[PDB]
Short mmCIF file of all heavy atoms in Angstrom, two decimals:
data_model
loop_
_atom_site.label_atom_id
_atom_site.label_comp_id
_atom_site.label_asym_id
_atom_site.label_seq_id
_atom_site.Cartn_x
_atom_site.Cartn_y
_atom_site.Cartn_z
N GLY A 8 58.23 16.68 -246.91
CA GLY A 8 58.03 18.12 -246.91
C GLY A 8 59.16 18.79 -246.26
O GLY A 8 59.92 18.26 -245.46
N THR A 9 59.35 20.13 -246.66
CA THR A 9 60.47 20.86 -246.05
C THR A 9 60.01 22.30 -245.81
O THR A 9 59.12 22.86 -246.52
CB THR A 9 61.66 20.83 -247.06
OG1 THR A 9 61.28 21.39 -248.29
CG2 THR A 9 62.22 19.52 -247.19
N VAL A 10 60.63 22.91 -244.73
CA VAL A 10 60.38 24.35 -244.57
C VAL A 10 61.64 25.05 -244.48
O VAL A 10 62.59 24.82 -243.75
CB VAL A 10 59.62 24.52 -243.15
CG1 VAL A 10 58.05 24.42 -243.37
CG2 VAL A 10 60.05 23.46 -242.17
N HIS A 11 61.78 26.03 -245.47
CA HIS A 11 62.90 26.83 -245.56
C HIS A 11 62.77 28.17 -244.79
O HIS A 11 62.00 29.03 -245.15
CB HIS A 11 63.19 27.13 -247.06
CG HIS A 11 64.41 27.94 -247.41
ND1 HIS A 11 64.46 29.08 -248.05
CD2 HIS A 11 65.71 27.60 -247.13
CE1 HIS A 11 65.65 29.44 -248.22
NE2 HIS A 11 66.46 28.63 -247.60
N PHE A 12 63.66 28.31 -243.76
CA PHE A 12 63.62 29.46 -242.93
C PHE A 12 64.57 30.51 -243.35
O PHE A 12 65.69 30.16 -243.75
CB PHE A 12 63.82 28.96 -241.48
CG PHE A 12 62.98 27.99 -241.04
CD1 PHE A 12 63.38 26.72 -240.69
CD2 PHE A 12 61.56 28.30 -240.83
CE1 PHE A 12 62.47 25.76 -240.21
CE2 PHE A 12 60.70 27.29 -240.37
CZ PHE A 12 61.20 25.99 -240.05
N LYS A 13 64.13 31.75 -243.35
CA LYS A 13 65.01 32.83 -243.78
C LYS A 13 65.35 33.75 -242.60
O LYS A 13 64.39 34.13 -241.86
CB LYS A 13 64.28 33.66 -244.86
CG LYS A 13 65.26 34.09 -246.00
CD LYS A 13 65.55 32.91 -246.98
CE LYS A 13 64.36 32.53 -247.83
NZ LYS A 13 63.35 31.68 -247.10
N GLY A 14 66.60 34.21 -242.50
CA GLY A 14 67.02 35.02 -241.42
C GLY A 14 67.59 36.38 -241.93
O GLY A 14 67.04 37.03 -242.80
N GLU A 15 68.71 36.67 -241.27
CA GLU A 15 69.41 37.97 -241.61
C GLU A 15 68.56 39.20 -241.27
O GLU A 15 68.80 40.32 -241.85
CB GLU A 15 69.93 37.98 -243.02
CG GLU A 15 70.98 36.93 -243.32
CD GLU A 15 71.32 36.81 -244.74
OE1 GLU A 15 70.52 36.34 -245.58
OE2 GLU A 15 72.44 37.17 -245.16
N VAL A 16 67.57 38.97 -240.47
CA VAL A 16 66.60 40.11 -240.08
C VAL A 16 67.26 41.03 -239.09
O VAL A 16 66.83 42.23 -239.01
CB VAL A 16 65.33 39.50 -239.49
CG1 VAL A 16 64.50 38.73 -240.60
CG2 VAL A 16 65.52 38.58 -238.29
N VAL A 17 68.27 40.53 -238.44
CA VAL A 17 68.92 41.35 -237.36
C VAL A 17 70.44 41.09 -237.45
O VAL A 17 70.91 40.10 -237.82
CB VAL A 17 68.48 40.97 -235.94
CG1 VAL A 17 66.97 41.41 -235.74
CG2 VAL A 17 68.71 39.49 -235.69
N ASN A 18 71.15 42.24 -237.05
CA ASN A 18 72.58 42.22 -237.08
C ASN A 18 73.02 43.19 -235.98
O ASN A 18 74.11 43.76 -236.07
CB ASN A 18 73.16 42.58 -238.41
CG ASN A 18 74.65 42.21 -238.49
OD1 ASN A 18 75.21 41.25 -237.80
ND2 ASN A 18 75.44 42.98 -239.25
N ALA A 19 72.13 43.50 -235.04
CA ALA A 19 72.42 44.52 -234.06
C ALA A 19 73.01 43.98 -232.77
O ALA A 19 74.24 44.11 -232.61
CB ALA A 19 71.08 45.20 -233.65
#
Side-chain angles (χ1 to χ4, degrees):
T9 57
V10 274
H11 183 236
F12 303 114
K13 222 78 73 278
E15 295 174 289
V16 294
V17 293
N18 194 32

